[PDB]
């Protein structure tokens, strides 16, 4: 017997990401001998990106491939299921936390309460900022109307004085063009180029070579399926799909990084200047970020569990010192 | 319906072998029992360094080795695992293999050997265990050091050490009997499983900025006898490829968890962790770069692999034209 699932991705049509996602659906058919077929839908095709969560919960969609932290406002734990400012910043660290330090189970338990089955994370990229204004130091963020993905990311930029705005990636170009926003933090170089941000913003803002991405060094996506639809899939196919997503996580990551390398030369020719903030700017953001980690971690039991296990890991690899944590607890 | 005997480079009792044993159960699950792999720890069927020939001839259906062990016979394999001061993050090697053309190069080079290179298996960086303190670059001179040969051994030889090749299972007695002064094997957890802390009270690592100078990404892989592979139906071939890719990271994560738990054990065993300086790293760097090119030029496959990696490294700022002055592959 054959099963058919409709799954919408956060990737807009015409992006390297959507192409990768399409390819994934044929890999799934191959790995299941045609027994599990996924019909891909680009961002907005069935429901607005920010409403996918509820659309999957109710079953209009069988599943989704979102940027996990989009649900931070309704599920605090999701702010910890993707990178946050100055925390773990390498793909391998997130892989370790999810797959051996207990992250996958925390995520699954939190989503299960929502009637969703969190399959696993999908590696992706660090994020960059596109700005119409040259933001060369920490102090230049004050007063900047900045599109960000809400949650803890938005809070850190707000603490730096920015006026944060929540908008889907597909609405960023017109917002910049119309002056609704001055800058935008969406994804990496290749996809941002696909969407044309270089045409409406001549500056790319990045951290120092030591800390390239201050805010989102590991911007994870994932695959989350309606729980009822998941439970109806035979276990053999469930296990195959889990493996398929884990393989895709890195095939996706690899494809994005390839496109990114090819994108930098393009920005140069577009007349875009890549601006690098300093290590001092990183220290100013760090002082604001750590307290915010704790504020978000204490929201519920899931956010507490995710953050506590990530904090112990960070202590283990020298990413945080006891001194910096003075007065902070869960 | 299909049963394969596969031997790993991991010794029984190590964290690595437990992960590998678990992988065989996952494979059975992913193929509904149609493909069953019988796991064998290091040395069970044949000696670790003899796996290459065992699989080629079919004595073994496959193997899970540290890829650079074949550097002597296949120069390209020195480039299918990390080398001194090159790409040093798991994600970079993953990108190189899966989107920058590395997997195809590996498969073509192994097919000529009658072997099917499934894919790389992520693992860890490696550390050094020493009986005497090695606190600076200059202290490597005269050290009898166990290393995995190939390019890794040459860089250490260039630094004045006397390198020796021994499978991980022979390191403990060699250290205890004075045959070697130090040994680079794998990460902290497995080295602890092997008991190195009982015979050497120092661990030598690079600075925080470069913790692993010679082997930051010590990749393993799965390689199957070519005829055995071609005899396996396409659907199952594909499922095994996905199984190994999933395993790559489950294995990596398992090793990293064990490593975090190992550092406290070394402290309790009275072992001192020594960190070399940024200057020591620069000194090794001057030696390593020229060696990369020496090995790169050996054949069509090593030339293709390094050319690709060098372009990647220049793309991400890992090498400067200044450092490459007078060097061409």
XYZ file of C-alpha atoms in Angstrom:
659
model
C 0.000 0.000 0.000
C 0.966 3.606 -0.736
C 0.768 6.592 1.628
C 0.636 10.199 0.424
C 1.619 13.222 2.477
C 1.343 16.891 1.644
C 4.233 18.811 3.203
C 4.885 22.520 2.916
C 8.338 23.991 3.426
C 9.360 27.396 4.751
C 11.440 27.753 1.582
C 9.935 30.090 -1.006
C 9.683 28.965 -4.625
C 12.731 29.903 -6.690
C 15.243 29.341 -3.918
C 18.091 26.851 -3.674
C 16.285 25.592 -0.563
C 13.077 24.732 -2.333
C 15.068 22.884 -5.031
C 16.779 20.841 -2.348
C 13.403 20.094 -0.754
C 11.903 18.920 -4.039
C 14.828 16.547 -4.536
C 14.178 15.225 -1.029
C 10.692 14.090 -1.970
C 12.071 11.879 -4.723
C 14.667 10.462 -2.341
C 11.845 9.512 0.025
C 9.932 7.719 -2.723
C 13.118 5.833 -3.625
C 13.927 4.835 -0.043
C 10.356 3.577 0.473
C 9.992 1.916 -2.933
C 7.135 4.273 -3.695
C 5.281 3.340 -0.510
C 5.537 6.833 1.016
C 5.140 9.753 -1.316
C 5.590 13.371 -0.307
C 3.945 16.141 -2.327
C 6.097 19.277 -1.873
C 4.542 22.741 -1.472
C 6.601 25.964 -1.414
C 6.113 28.622 1.285
C 2.565 30.007 1.290
C 1.149 27.580 -1.265
C -1.303 26.025 1.229
C -1.143 28.283 4.247
C 0.953 31.244 5.326
C 4.315 30.171 6.719
C 3.590 31.347 10.254
C 0.308 29.419 10.275
C 1.805 26.090 9.167
C 2.053 24.931 12.783
C -1.721 25.105 13.234
C -2.414 23.770 9.752
C -0.379 20.645 10.521
C -1.877 20.381 13.990
C -5.370 20.358 12.477
C -4.434 18.119 9.569
C -4.988 20.395 6.565
C -1.295 19.666 5.958
C 0.222 16.282 6.836
C 3.527 17.855 7.797
C 5.908 20.769 7.489
C 9.559 21.669 6.990
C 9.811 24.994 8.911
C 12.557 26.961 10.584
C 11.838 25.576 14.046
C 12.210 28.796 15.981
C 9.150 30.297 14.241
C 7.068 28.691 17.030
C 8.986 30.406 19.828
C 5.983 32.572 20.656
C 3.679 29.628 21.326
C 6.238 26.919 22.251
C 9.158 28.471 24.213
C 11.184 25.261 23.794
C 11.470 25.976 20.054
C 13.703 29.006 20.799
C 16.160 26.364 22.005
C 15.659 23.971 19.090
C 17.611 26.275 16.790
C 20.575 28.563 17.469
C 20.337 31.612 19.674
C 22.829 34.422 20.230
C 26.305 33.401 21.291
C 25.409 29.863 22.352
C 26.519 26.624 20.663
C 27.573 27.784 17.189
C 28.677 24.799 15.109
C 26.484 22.332 13.192
C 28.292 19.429 14.911
C 27.477 20.799 18.377
C 23.797 20.931 17.594
C 23.963 17.429 16.110
C 25.606 16.201 19.332
C 23.069 17.874 21.594
C 20.129 16.487 19.649
C 21.421 12.992 19.090
C 23.348 12.044 22.213
C 22.708 14.655 24.902
C 18.947 14.200 24.957
C 17.705 17.010 22.710
C 15.705 14.835 20.353
C 13.589 13.388 23.192
C 12.902 16.805 24.733
C 11.732 18.073 21.329
C 9.591 15.025 20.711
C 7.884 15.213 24.094
C 7.104 18.920 23.741
C 5.675 18.498 20.212
C 3.715 15.388 21.167
C 1.740 17.494 23.639
C 0.770 19.597 20.591
C -0.377 16.623 18.543
C 2.743 16.749 16.365
C 5.567 14.318 15.802
C 8.942 16.110 15.640
C 11.018 13.885 13.331
C 14.406 15.529 13.624
C 16.387 18.691 12.872
C 17.536 19.624 9.393
C 20.951 21.343 9.288
C 21.043 24.468 7.222
C 23.260 27.517 7.694
C 24.313 30.569 9.690
C 22.267 33.714 8.956
C 23.430 37.129 7.762
C 21.844 40.590 7.869
C 21.072 42.790 4.837
C 20.814 46.481 5.556
C 20.180 49.678 3.618
C 22.179 51.497 6.309
C 25.833 50.752 7.135
C 25.737 49.122 10.581
C 29.425 49.017 11.563
C 29.276 48.716 15.351
C 27.027 47.615 18.205
C 25.773 51.180 18.677
C 24.513 51.397 15.082
C 21.655 48.973 15.834
C 19.793 51.571 17.912
C 16.677 52.761 16.065
C 17.065 50.315 13.177
C 13.771 48.801 11.974
C 14.884 45.189 11.679
C 13.031 42.146 10.406
C 13.890 39.132 12.598
C 12.240 35.735 13.306
C 10.837 36.827 16.663
C 11.529 34.851 19.807
C 14.855 35.126 21.572
C 16.526 36.399 18.377
C 14.219 39.407 18.335
C 14.691 40.031 22.048
C 18.472 40.292 21.776
C 18.249 42.769 18.890
C 15.611 44.722 20.832
C 17.951 44.863 23.836
C 20.495 46.442 21.471
C 17.945 49.130 20.615
C 16.548 47.844 17.317
C 12.834 48.043 16.461
C 12.093 44.463 15.513
C 9.509 43.400 12.959
C 8.142 39.912 12.267
C 7.696 39.146 8.545
C 7.916 36.070 6.327
C 11.033 35.968 4.155
C 8.897 36.472 1.070
C 7.726 39.861 2.288
C 11.198 41.198 3.050
C 12.030 42.578 -0.395
C 8.972 44.864 -0.615
C 9.305 45.901 3.052
C 12.886 47.039 2.349
C 11.912 48.708 -0.910
C 9.034 50.605 0.721
C 11.116 51.555 3.746
C 8.923 49.623 6.157
C 12.210 48.156 7.409
C 15.842 49.258 7.239
C 17.418 45.815 7.549
C 16.576 42.126 7.609
C 17.934 38.951 9.142
C 16.649 36.123 6.941
C 18.922 33.261 5.933
C 22.371 32.780 4.359
C 24.004 34.436 1.287
C 22.785 32.160 -1.504
C 19.066 32.243 -0.713
C 19.055 35.939 0.235
C 20.612 36.535 -3.201
C 17.917 34.340 -4.828
C 15.298 36.618 -3.283
C 17.145 39.730 -4.465
C 17.922 41.557 -1.231
C 21.144 42.897 -2.797
C 18.980 45.017 -5.090
C 17.320 46.879 -2.206
C 20.097 46.834 0.432
C 23.754 47.394 -0.317
C 25.232 46.224 2.946
C 25.575 42.780 4.433
C 26.296 42.858 8.172
C 28.278 39.970 9.733
C 30.204 39.335 12.917
C 34.053 39.199 13.104
C 35.928 36.251 11.576
C 36.056 34.859 15.128
C 32.240 35.019 15.480
C 30.766 35.234 11.914
C 27.189 34.899 13.113
C 26.388 36.558 16.405
C 22.667 35.799 16.388
C 21.962 32.659 14.340
C 25.043 30.505 13.645
C 22.995 27.288 13.244
C 19.546 28.140 11.883
C 17.852 24.753 11.999
C 14.842 23.561 10.043
C 13.084 20.271 10.848
C 10.347 17.927 9.711
C 7.281 17.769 11.946
C 4.315 15.529 11.052
C 0.674 15.560 12.227
C 0.753 13.014 15.066
C -2.331 11.123 13.898
C -0.989 10.814 10.355
C 2.354 9.712 11.826
C 0.841 6.967 13.965
C -1.045 5.636 10.932
C 2.187 5.087 9.034
C 3.520 1.508 9.508
C 6.574 1.398 11.791
C 8.900 0.196 9.012
C 8.062 3.299 6.986
C 8.239 5.519 10.074
C 11.791 4.301 10.687
C 12.679 4.770 7.026
C 11.360 8.348 7.065
C 13.400 9.181 10.180
C 16.547 7.920 8.455
C 15.576 9.785 5.283
C 15.241 13.090 7.161
C 18.595 12.593 8.930
C 20.346 11.924 5.598
C 18.564 14.937 4.067
C 19.630 17.173 6.944
C 23.214 17.024 5.716
C 22.497 16.761 1.989
C 20.476 19.977 2.483
C 23.251 21.538 4.571
C 25.816 20.580 1.929
C 23.751 21.997 -0.945
C 23.223 25.301 0.841
C 26.925 25.654 1.664
C 27.845 24.966 -1.972
C 25.436 27.662 -3.170
C 26.791 30.018 -0.464
C 30.378 29.756 -1.696
C 29.139 30.628 -5.190
C 27.085 33.529 -3.851
C 29.846 35.632 -2.284
C 31.488 36.494 -5.634
C 28.029 37.579 -6.832
C 27.566 40.039 -3.974
C 30.892 41.638 -4.849
C 29.750 42.255 -8.416
C 26.392 43.567 -7.167
C 28.235 46.331 -5.347
C 27.341 44.967 -1.921
C 29.818 45.660 0.862
C 30.247 42.962 3.463
C 30.651 44.714 6.827
C 32.304 42.906 9.740
C 31.528 43.843 13.326
C 34.306 43.649 15.940
C 35.087 41.264 18.814
C 34.099 44.123 21.112
C 30.692 44.327 19.429
C 30.397 40.612 20.132
C 31.180 41.207 23.825
C 28.469 43.891 24.022
C 25.923 41.488 22.528
C 27.112 38.709 24.857
C 26.371 40.761 27.992
C 22.780 41.178 26.801
C 22.336 37.637 25.487
C 23.166 35.503 28.499
C 20.507 37.040 30.755
C 17.994 36.609 27.933
C 18.861 32.916 27.610
C 17.726 32.482 31.207
C 14.571 34.521 30.775
C 13.480 32.255 27.922
C 14.701 29.050 29.563
C 12.430 29.609 32.572
C 9.243 29.879 30.500
C 8.137 26.260 30.866
C 9.470 22.820 31.675
C 10.574 22.057 28.112
C 12.532 25.242 27.624
C 14.113 24.579 31.043
C 15.186 21.050 30.061
C 16.554 22.075 26.664
C 18.498 25.011 28.004
C 19.856 23.193 31.054
C 21.324 20.371 28.933
C 22.733 22.888 26.420
C 24.227 24.974 29.253
C 25.989 21.957 30.762
C 27.338 21.104 27.293
C 28.567 24.723 26.844
C 30.255 24.566 30.236
C 31.868 21.345 29.101
C 33.396 22.850 25.962
C 34.372 26.220 27.400
C 31.600 28.283 25.833
C 30.529 29.871 29.113
C 32.198 30.561 32.454
C 30.746 30.336 35.960
C 31.611 34.021 36.366
C 29.368 35.106 33.496
C 26.560 33.147 35.088
C 26.635 34.980 38.438
C 23.115 35.353 39.813
C 21.485 33.399 36.989
C 19.558 30.166 37.616
C 16.677 28.101 36.229
C 18.164 -12.755 2.426
C 21.518 -10.943 2.388
C 24.152 -11.391 5.092
C 27.412 -9.440 5.256
C 30.379 -9.848 7.575
C 31.871 -6.432 8.355
C 34.842 -5.793 10.634
C 35.444 -2.393 12.228
C 38.674 -0.704 13.243
C 37.104 -0.272 16.735
C 38.275 -2.766 19.430
C 35.638 -4.626 21.468
C 34.850 -2.860 24.720
C 35.313 0.600 23.225
C 32.530 3.156 22.885
C 33.064 2.979 19.141
C 32.427 -0.747 18.935
C 29.213 -0.468 20.939
C 27.991 2.154 18.445
C 28.959 -0.050 15.503
C 27.168 -3.085 16.989
C 24.045 -0.940 17.368
C 24.332 0.133 13.746
C 23.955 -3.458 12.573
C 20.596 -3.629 14.378
C 19.510 -0.357 12.745
C 20.391 -1.744 9.305
C 18.248 -4.830 9.910
C 15.372 -2.539 10.932
C 15.761 -0.261 7.897
C 15.743 -3.172 5.443
C 13.021 -5.193 7.172
C 15.608 -7.893 7.851
C 16.624 -8.300 4.212
C 20.135 -7.042 4.818
C 21.914 -8.249 7.916
C 25.432 -7.215 8.792
C 27.407 -9.373 11.196
C 29.723 -7.093 13.192
C 33.292 -8.096 14.050
C 35.533 -6.073 16.380
C 39.069 -5.157 15.362
C 41.286 -8.225 14.899
C 38.450 -10.767 15.083
C 38.525 -11.913 11.455
C 41.807 -10.358 10.317
C 44.300 -7.771 11.524
C 43.153 -4.144 11.283
C 45.642 -3.212 8.578
C 44.728 -6.372 6.682
C 41.059 -5.447 6.243
C 41.651 -3.765 2.881
C 42.849 -6.995 1.305
C 40.324 -9.115 3.183
C 37.433 -7.138 1.697
C 38.985 -6.887 -1.771
C 39.326 -10.691 -1.960
C 36.007 -11.273 -0.227
C 37.284 -12.825 3.007
C 35.280 -9.950 4.499
C 32.188 -8.523 2.792
C 33.046 -5.073 4.085
C 34.935 -2.956 6.591
C 34.554 0.120 8.829
C 38.134 1.502 8.945
C 39.777 4.862 9.509
C 40.141 5.758 5.849
C 43.676 7.130 5.922
C 44.995 3.668 6.879
C 45.228 2.991 3.134
C 47.424 6.034 2.432
C 50.389 3.854 1.533
C 48.563 2.042 -1.256
C 45.990 4.718 -2.245
C 47.439 8.251 -1.898
C 43.954 9.772 -2.258
C 42.984 8.286 1.115
C 45.313 10.721 2.899
C 42.851 13.321 1.552
C 39.696 11.410 2.539
C 40.322 12.136 6.219
C 41.753 15.211 7.895
C 45.405 16.185 7.615
C 47.486 18.763 9.521
C 46.092 22.292 9.473
C 43.593 21.697 6.662
C 39.767 21.705 6.875
C 39.144 21.145 10.575
C 35.394 20.999 11.220
C 33.047 18.054 10.691
C 30.694 20.267 8.684
C 33.469 21.278 6.240
C 34.311 17.643 5.438
C 30.609 16.907 5.129
C 30.277 19.748 2.617
C 33.351 18.699 0.683
C 32.129 15.112 0.379
C 28.486 15.756 -0.318
C 28.310 18.872 -2.465
C 31.831 19.747 -3.584
C 32.511 16.465 -5.395
C 34.445 14.490 -2.810
C 32.160 11.446 -2.608
C 32.402 10.810 -6.365
C 36.208 11.024 -6.273
C 36.307 8.539 -3.403
C 33.954 6.123 -5.148
C 35.890 6.169 -8.417
C 39.227 5.638 -6.720
C 37.908 2.709 -4.675
C 36.086 1.124 -7.622
C 39.479 0.740 -9.305
C 40.435 -1.345 -6.251
C 37.368 -3.556 -6.533
C 35.723 -1.830 -3.569
C 32.594 0.265 -3.108
C 33.143 3.306 -0.864
C 29.692 3.887 0.632
C 30.455 7.128 2.411
C 32.380 8.773 5.270
C 31.552 8.262 8.944
C 32.055 11.260 11.221
C 33.966 10.634 14.384
C 36.179 13.016 16.303
C 39.453 14.902 16.538
C 42.438 12.935 17.962
C 44.638 13.665 20.967
C 48.144 12.579 21.975
C 49.121 10.607 25.082
C 52.682 10.922 26.352
C 54.795 9.561 29.190
C 56.896 12.730 29.294
C 55.632 16.317 29.054
C 55.679 17.785 25.546
C 54.976 21.465 26.145
C 56.250 23.121 22.975
C 57.004 22.432 19.329
C 60.674 21.839 20.090
C 59.827 19.004 22.506
C 58.728 16.725 19.652
C 62.347 16.257 18.571
C 63.503 12.737 19.440
C 60.065 11.527 20.501
C 59.237 7.960 19.444
C 55.655 8.571 18.392
C 52.921 6.179 17.290
C 50.843 7.696 14.441
C 48.636 6.329 11.620
C 51.335 6.747 8.970
C 50.770 8.597 5.713
C 50.709 12.386 5.715
C 50.145 12.509 9.487
C 53.369 10.643 10.151
C 55.374 12.775 7.728
C 54.402 16.032 9.427
C 55.501 14.653 12.770
C 58.707 13.314 11.199
C 59.265 16.812 9.827
C 59.051 18.050 13.432
C 61.814 15.701 14.585
C 59.834 12.770 15.978
C 60.555 9.121 15.218
C 57.195 7.829 14.014
C 55.961 4.230 14.345
C 52.839 2.502 13.010
C 50.817 0.291 15.352
C 47.110 -0.552 15.493
C 45.379 1.073 18.468
C 45.266 -2.248 20.291
C 49.070 -2.428 20.484
C 49.669 1.062 21.849
C 49.284 0.282 25.577
C 52.021 -2.380 25.788
C 54.294 -0.359 23.505
C 53.994 2.581 25.894
C 54.401 0.486 29.007
C 57.510 -1.249 27.645
C 59.240 1.923 26.450
C 58.890 1.058 22.766
C 57.245 4.443 22.209
C 57.281 7.671 24.225
C 53.908 8.880 23.027
C 50.926 7.954 20.948
C 48.269 9.683 18.926
C 45.274 7.354 18.576
C 41.733 8.699 18.828
C 39.702 10.962 21.104
C 39.616 10.927 24.954
C 36.837 8.390 25.661
C 38.127 5.492 23.534
C 41.751 6.154 24.492
C 40.545 5.877 28.076
C 38.715 2.617 27.284
C 42.087 1.338 26.036
C 43.737 2.334 29.294
C 46.323 4.836 28.047
C 45.939 6.796 31.312
C 47.478 3.882 33.239
C 50.743 4.117 31.304
C 51.080 7.813 30.368
C 50.216 10.734 32.622
C 50.090 13.474 29.974
C 47.729 14.364 27.162
C 49.041 16.787 24.559
C 46.593 18.973 22.609
C 46.772 22.167 20.577
C 45.673 25.614 21.829
C 41.953 26.333 22.393
C 41.950 27.960 18.958
C 43.337 24.807 17.316
C 42.780 21.859 19.735
C 43.735 19.288 17.103
C 46.763 20.115 15.010
C 47.180 16.915 13.004
C 43.815 15.153 13.001
C 40.795 17.420 13.683
C 38.391 15.240 11.637
C 39.476 11.591 11.796
C 36.950 9.969 9.450
C 35.974 6.335 9.288
C 33.969 4.930 6.393
C 32.131 1.880 5.133
C 33.676 0.111 2.143
C 32.118 -3.007 0.642
C 33.566 -5.667 -1.666
C 32.490 -4.438 -5.136
C 30.952 -7.752 -6.274
C 29.081 -8.096 -3.000
C 27.750 -4.573 -3.514
C 26.711 -5.120 -7.148
C 24.951 -8.322 -6.102
C 22.743 -6.304 -3.769
C 19.479 -5.023 -5.322
C 19.361 -1.267 -5.960
C 16.619 -0.562 -3.391
C 18.716 -2.115 -0.623
C 21.878 -0.423 -1.903
C 20.140 2.926 -1.501
C 18.777 2.044 1.923
C 22.271 1.077 3.088
C 23.712 4.348 1.783
C 21.129 6.279 3.809
C 21.750 4.000 6.794
C 25.476 4.781 6.775
C 24.862 8.511 6.381
C 22.484 8.497 9.367
C 24.964 6.365 11.329
C 27.812 8.737 10.538
C 26.244 11.342 12.787
C 24.712 8.995 15.399
C 28.283 7.629 15.776
C 29.787 11.142 15.924
C 27.278 12.171 18.599
C 27.869 9.032 20.658
C 31.619 9.542 20.605
C 31.260 13.201 21.592
C 28.989 12.326 24.534
C 31.533 9.747 25.747
C 34.321 12.354 25.353
C 32.586 14.872 27.627
C 32.355 12.137 30.268
C 36.004 11.108 29.811
C 37.749 14.363 30.716
C 36.721 14.073 34.384
C 38.090 10.522 34.452
C 41.497 11.682 33.217
C 41.541 14.283 35.994
C 40.742 11.600 38.568
C 43.508 9.407 37.105
C 46.039 12.196 37.633
C 46.641 12.853 33.940
C 47.666 16.423 33.006
C 46.228 17.983 29.839
C 48.933 20.055 28.154
C 48.030 22.711 25.624
C 50.518 23.850 23.001
C 50.583 27.535 21.924
C 49.433 29.418 18.844
C 53.102 29.767 17.922
C 53.587 25.980 18.063
C 50.699 25.698 15.590
C 52.365 28.145 13.188
C 55.565 26.125 13.325
C 53.715 22.933 12.375
C 51.827 24.867 9.721
C 55.030 25.891 7.900
C 55.937 22.193 7.731
C 52.498 20.857 6.808
C 51.640 23.004 3.792
C 54.579 21.786 1.689
C 53.728 18.194 2.622
C 50.131 18.606 1.441
C 51.465 19.297 -2.084
C 53.952 16.453 -1.962
C 51.143 13.990 -1.273
C 48.687 15.775 -3.549
C 50.856 15.259 -6.627
C 51.101 11.457 -6.229
C 48.313 10.495 -8.649
C 45.184 11.483 -10.537
C 42.912 10.931 -7.535
C 44.981 12.719 -4.883
C 45.494 15.604 -7.332
C 41.744 15.853 -7.930
C 40.862 15.665 -4.225
C 43.405 18.201 -2.999
C 42.686 20.612 -5.858
C 39.078 20.630 -4.720
C 39.916 20.998 -1.025
C 42.455 23.736 -1.659
C 39.902 25.819 -3.538
C 37.462 25.307 -0.667
C 40.079 26.328 1.897
C 40.914 29.474 -0.033
C 37.208 30.180 -0.314
C 36.784 30.143 3.469
C 40.088 31.832 4.358
C 41.926 28.745 5.616
C 45.020 29.392 3.471
C 46.586 32.564 2.035
C 48.438 32.968 -1.256
C 51.413 34.180 0.754
C 51.681 30.811 2.515
C 51.427 29.035 -0.819
C 54.345 30.979 -2.335
C 56.236 28.664 -4.668
C 53.819 25.741 -4.316
C 51.754 24.382 -7.193
C 49.733 21.167 -7.515
